[PDB]
């Protein structure tokens, strides 16, 4: 039999079966730990070992990658890099994708602190109390990390969904707000400036 015309090679079977023994794990990791967005703090070692199993066979690569008009191993790594660049879990990872990053691991705890205060303060009158001094520093920390990535240049998906839940739960379903009835001192100015041009026109029209 000629090489790679009918079938595989013995030193290319394991070079294919390791990737299938791991990419199923990573795809399952995404969809199992998907919608409560815990993704960047769960699936990054599985993702990095998928990258490494791509590399150790990418270095019969021309017998697998460039051997078929629908390059299955290329388009599958391409989709994972598409997700990993769209999620940007590299923000949530410390130095060499080994551990979680320095600030965000504390941001996730202040998310959990704010949820514990929400739960222990359970007609949402007193829930507007007792947590506004923690919701404010939580939003301050989020905006501080967002300005941090602004100085480097959408953030990491793990923290953006946490702040999205926090804002979607504080602002509505609690309706906690401050009126700040500063309407009439605005109207005390916004009418006086609009009253200037009729004075300016009818002043010079008579003189």
């Amino acid at each position: 039999l000629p090489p790679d015309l009918p079938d595989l090679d013995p030193e290319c079977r394991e070079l294919l079966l390791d990737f299938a023994n791991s990419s199923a794990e990573l795809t399952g990791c995404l969809v199992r730990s998907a919608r409560p967005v815990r993704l960047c703090q769960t699936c990054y070692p599985l993702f990095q070992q998928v990258v490494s199993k791509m590399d150790n066979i990418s270095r019969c690569a021309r017998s697998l990658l460039m051997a078929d008009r629908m390059q299955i191993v290329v388009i599958l790594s391409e989709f994972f890099n598409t997700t990993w660049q769209e999620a940007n879990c590299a923000n949530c990872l410390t130095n060499n994708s080994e551990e979680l990053s320095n600030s965000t691991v504390y941001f996730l705890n202040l998310f959990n602190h704010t949820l514990t205060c929400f739960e222990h303060n359970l007609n949402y009158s007193e829930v507007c109390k007792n947590c506004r001094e923690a919701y404010k520093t939580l939003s301050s920390l989020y905006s501080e990390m967002q300005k941090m990535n602004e100085l480097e240049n959408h953030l990491c998906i793990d923290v953006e969904d946490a702040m999205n839940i926090t804002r979607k739960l504080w602002s509505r379903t609690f309706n906690c707000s401050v009126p700040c009835s500063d309407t009439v001192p605005v109207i005390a100015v916004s009418v006086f400036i609009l009253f200037l041009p009729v004075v300016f026109y009818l002043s010079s029209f008579l003189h």
Binding site: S139, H154, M163, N164, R167, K168, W170, S171, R172, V178, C180, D182, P185, V186, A188, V189, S190, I193, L194, L196, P197, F200, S204, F205
Partner: protein, 676 residues
């Protein structure tokens, strides 16, 4: 308002000066000067764009950082007083320098240059002081938060650059710079002003052939191939210069993704495709835009007439513009404060997300409609996914900004009208798309990114009734050539439906100053007038061998101040008064290589000064080598549509009328011909 002479003298000193260059140098000088006009206009455009967006980013960063500190505390009204001041500061600086120093830099530069290419020389139109003041004023007014555009004054900037640097002369510095020394007649000046206006149009809107056809609309001359190809040359130079320099400002250089100051994008993406059945929809939008243009121009006309009659002190119309900026600040803050919707960042659509009352993740919608350049709003009234605005907010912005732009035109500031017309027209023209999506369900062909463009073209053709150059600009700036057909139907419709009511915004402010302004054709509802009506039958003619006692009689009479004389009675040619004083200063008598005619060429020395003596009142002056030996001598019985298409097409400012006898009877100048 005195015309200039695009016609050539062709006397004996012209025939001598034709030698020694044909015994080929000047053509490459023409090409290099046109290239420098293009480069300098591109550099001025980059100056304006970078300085304006940096100053405006500074201003709105200061204001945006202010309001969020004062939100929950209760000092919102004290932040209104800052932004009402920050508008009023720059407009005050931006109008004082315009009113007292050079009042000709008011409004746009486009009516003055449009009157220039017809031959009329408005006095202070092409000085360098006018350039400096108009550029500084458009920076201070676009940064000054008014409802203005900065593509208006790019025509006058390019025209002033072109009339300046094609001289090798400044005269506002009293210097000489004898480098070109041949491009100092009004023919060359008019040709280079045509090149500079075309480069200004191309630097403004990013379409070069719009620039060439614009500078060929006005100055409806005979066709001249190498001229128009040089005009196109300078246009391409200016576009590529602007594109290259704004490219390397963003540190990329490798795409060249900005040909003009306003840039529309790519209209090909198959959600923008149009069908043949919605052509009457486009006609209907042309009707709608062609009557709001009439409303705009009419309400400006009764507003401008008031300002001319009363507010004409140069220190009093300055106070007006400050209050205009204050009203823009107050009205915009009132509209922002009272918008009940919030809408999140879609990925960088707003660029200054001003949360007022929202739910801590979302931002205000109306603060995106204000707090921006109008140009980003116009591009974003295009190109959005459908279902991306609130029609109360977006229609409410339209209902205010139309009157704010109608009210901010005749001030003593350097402003535009294009992008305010495009911001109005892309607004209600967007709203028609939401209504078509409301009355047809989720129809694909009612994509409001398509109808927002037809409304922009409709409004822009309604307000400034200009079709051929505008159609090519709108067909090329979108970079899709199948859109020219609905756009040209829209523009025809809007011009007809507009001219059945009112004149037109550029022509109306021309007519309010009573400049002559020869139109494109004759008023075709005038019958076969021969030349025996439209001429001036008492003629002040001269002679060839004539005693100088009727020269100083006719140069100085203080009640019949003319310019240009035919010499005889038969006819021998035409002599110019601007050429005939140089015959008196240098004492040409029987008892000079066309360079004393051209050294002190602009602002010819007025004959009061010379003081000829009484014995030189019987001496004889022979001007046979100075007259134009070939004037343009229409007969008496020539009809009026014949004598227009010589006087208008060829760049004339005299026209002799003679007979079968070749007796000189009458003469046709511009004032004696644009009075019908």
């Amino acid at each position: 308002y005195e015309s200039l002479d695009y016609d050539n003298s062709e006397n004996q000193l012209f025939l001598e000066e034709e030698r020694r260059i044909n015994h080929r140098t000047v053509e490459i000088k023409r090409w290099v000067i046109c290239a420098l006009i293009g480069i300098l206009t591109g550099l001025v455009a980059c100056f304006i764009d970078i300085v304006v967006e940096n100053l405006a980013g500074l201003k709105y960063r200061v204001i945006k950082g202010n309001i969020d500190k004062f939100t929950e505390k209760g000092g919102l009204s004290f932040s209104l007083l800052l932004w009402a001041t920050l508008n009023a500061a720059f407009v005050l600086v931006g109008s004082v320098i315009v009113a007292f120093i050079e009042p000709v830099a008011a409004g746009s530069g486009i009516p003055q240059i449009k009157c220039f290419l017809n031959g009329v020389k408005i006095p202070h139109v092409v000085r360098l002081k006018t350039l400096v003041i108009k550029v500084s004023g458009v920076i201070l007014s676009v940064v000054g938060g008014l409802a203005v555009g900065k593509e208006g004054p790019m025509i006058h900037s390019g025209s002033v650059i072109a009339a300046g640097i094609s001289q090798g002369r400044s005269t506002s510095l009293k210097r000489d710079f004898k480098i070109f020394e041949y491009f100092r007649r009004d023919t060359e000046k008019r040709d280079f002003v045509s090149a500079g206006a075309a480069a200004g149009v191309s630097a403004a809107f990013g379409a070069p052939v719009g620039g060439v056809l614009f500078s060929l609309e006005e100055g409806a001359s005979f066709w001249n191939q190498f001229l128009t190809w040089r005009i196109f040359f300078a246009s391409m130079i200016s576009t590529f210069t602007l594109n290259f320099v704004l490219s390397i400002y963003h540190g990329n250089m490798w795409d060249l993704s900005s040909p003009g100051l306003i840039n529309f994008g790519r209209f090909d993406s198959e959600k923008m495709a149009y069908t043949i059945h919605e052509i009457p929809v486009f006609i209907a939008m042309g009707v709608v835009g062609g009557v709001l243009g009439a409303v705009f121009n009419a309400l400006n006309y009764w507003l401008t007439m008031f300002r001319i009659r009363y507010i004409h002190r140069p220190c009093l119309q300055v106070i007006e513009a400050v209050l205009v900026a204050a009203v823009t600040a107050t009205v915009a803050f009132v509209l922002i404060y009272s918008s009940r919707d919030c809408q999140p960042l879609q990925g960088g659509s707003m660029s200054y997300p001003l949360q007022l009352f929202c739910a801590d993740g979302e931002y205000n919608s109306m603060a995106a409609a204000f707090f921006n350049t109008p140009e980003k709003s116009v591009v974003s009234l295009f190109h959005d996914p459908p279902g991306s605005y609130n029609p109360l907010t977006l229609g409410l912005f339209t209902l205010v900004y139309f009157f704010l732009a109608c009210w901010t035109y005749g001030l003593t500031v350097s402003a535009g009208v294009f992008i305010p017309s495009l911001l109005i027209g892309a607004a209600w023209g967007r709203l028609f798309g939401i209504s078509l999506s409301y009355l047809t369900g989720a129809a694909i062909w009612a994509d409001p990114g398509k109808y927002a463009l037809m409304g922009a073209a409709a409004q822009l053709g309604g307000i400034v009734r200009m079709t051929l150059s505008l159609t090519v600009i709108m067909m090329e700036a979108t970079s899709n050539v199948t859109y020219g057909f609905p756009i040209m139907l829209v523009l025809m419709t809007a011009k007809i439906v507009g001219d059945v009511f009112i004149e037109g915004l550029y022509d109306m402010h021309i007519q309010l100053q009573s400049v002559p302004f020869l139109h494109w054709e004759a008023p075709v509802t005038s019958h076969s007038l021969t030349a025996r009506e439209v001429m001036s039958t008492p003629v002040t003619c001269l002679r060839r061998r004539e005693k100088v006692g009727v020269i100083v009689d006719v140069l100085s009479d203080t009640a019949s101040n003319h310019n240009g004389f035919p010499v005889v009675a038969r006819l021998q040619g035409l002599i110019l008064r601007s050429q005939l004083i140089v015959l008196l200063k240098h004492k040409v008598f029987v008892e000079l290589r066309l360079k004393d005619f051209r050294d002190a060429y602009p602002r010819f020395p007025p004959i009061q000064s010379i003081h000829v003596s009484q014995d030189e009142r019987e001496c004889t002056m022979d001007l046979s080598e100075f007259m134009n030996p070939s004037p343009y001598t229409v007969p008496q019985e020539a009809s009026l549509p014949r004598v227009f298409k010589l006087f208008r097409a060829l760049g004339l400012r005299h026209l002799v009328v003679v007979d079968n006898r070749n007796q000189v009877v009458g003469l046709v100048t511009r004032k004696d011909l644009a009075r019908y």
